[PDB]
């Protein structure tokens, strides 16, 4: 087409969503560059699966999905196919045949408050593991014992979501990290997001 793909409206999001309620953006009908992503040095993590970043500028796709959220440092490893942990199982799971790229950078200067930034949450309890690209935002009281929680928190009755600490003095493994997961699909339809 002619219009450029609004990657500025997903990477530079003043506010990102919590990982349990990860935001998904649909990219379609635009020329997607790919030079400045792999050329920008702001990113701490840049790993691509199923395709190469150099061979990405000259390749067509029907749709491109930009999923963005916030986790902590030692949980960045889990944003990859075939990983396990609280984030991979209960918050954001990538399929074993994932074809895309994962991009993350430290946002401690933005997502930390000196009293502790308690706005970013993650799902701590769930009866079953999330299956790929599933989003669970329910806040149902987790009944961990026999006793039916009548919607009231207490003993063996949790709130399923836990809050990140996120204080600027935190260690690197506990500082906030903003993540962008670009997934490329090639459905049986003319393509809309190619590039260069």
């Amino acid at each position, epitope marked *: 087409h*002619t*219009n*450029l*793909c*609004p*990657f*500025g*409206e997903v*990477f*530079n*999001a*003043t*506010r990102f969503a919590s990982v349990y309620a990860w935001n998904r953006k649909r990219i379609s009908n*635009c*020329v997607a*560059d790919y*030079s*400045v*992503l792999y050329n*920008s040095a702001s990113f701490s993590t840049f790993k691509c699966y199923g395709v190469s970043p150099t061979k990405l500028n000259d390749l067509c796709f029907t749709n491109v999905y930009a999923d963005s959220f916030v986790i902590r440092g030692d949980e960045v490893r889990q944003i990859a196919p075939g990983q396990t942990g609280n984030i991979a199982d209960y918050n954001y799971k990538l399929p074993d045949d994932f074809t895309g790229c994962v991009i993350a950078w430290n946002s401690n200067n933005l997502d930390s408050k000196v009293g502790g930034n308690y706005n970013y949450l993650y799902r701590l309890f769930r009866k079953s593991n999330l299956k790929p690209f599933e989003r669970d935002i329910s806040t149902e009281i987790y009944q961990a014992g026999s006793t039916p929680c009548n919607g009231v928190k207490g003993f063996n009755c949790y709130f399923p979501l836990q809050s990140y600490g996120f204080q600027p003095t935190y260690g690197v493994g506990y500082q906030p990290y903003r993540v962008v997961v670009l997934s490329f699909e090639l459905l049986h339809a003319p393509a809309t997001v190619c590039g260069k």
Partner: antibody
Amino acid sequence: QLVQSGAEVKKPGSSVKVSCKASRGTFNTYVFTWVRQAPGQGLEWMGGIIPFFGTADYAQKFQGRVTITADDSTSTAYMELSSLRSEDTAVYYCSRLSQWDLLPMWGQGTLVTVSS
Amino acid sequence: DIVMTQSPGTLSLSPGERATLSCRASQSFTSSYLAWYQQKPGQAPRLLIYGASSRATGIPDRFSGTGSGTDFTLTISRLEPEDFAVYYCQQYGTSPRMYTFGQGTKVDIKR
């Protein structure tokens, strides 16, 4: 961190062409627009161009009088304003966007004086 | 086009108070953004807030920004003497056609 050409002095009815050199080859991912500001007045958008496609759009108040071009090889955008009048005396700015961030880069501005 | 209207025309405030500036759009920001600029006499515009709620580099933390859709706000928690100038809001977009400015708001030392 755009760099514009020097100040200009023109007679009424003449034309002026202001350049805007992009820092290295950042060109194609960008949209470059031209905004002017008369002395002591507000900001007025004149037009824009998408370098990688050469597609340019303009404000109807200026349609015809302004032509915005671009050269990808030199990382430079251009704004030509013809049939100049005294009311065209202003500081002219070039500004841009980015494909992968939302941030407005601005040039230093070019003073164009249209009078005898 | 998208018409950007600012208010008030002149904001007469004492140094040390909290300033509040409004920026209205003719249509909801479907695929558009918003920045705030500050201009002092004889100077170029200076970017303060972008993306409605993103502080630019070097801008003091007393400058804040809020809003969504058609109504937006530029909040200055404590007005400093170096903050008495004209403020503009401009909406931008991925494409070239979007860009439009507001008519500006003068923040003067009240008396």
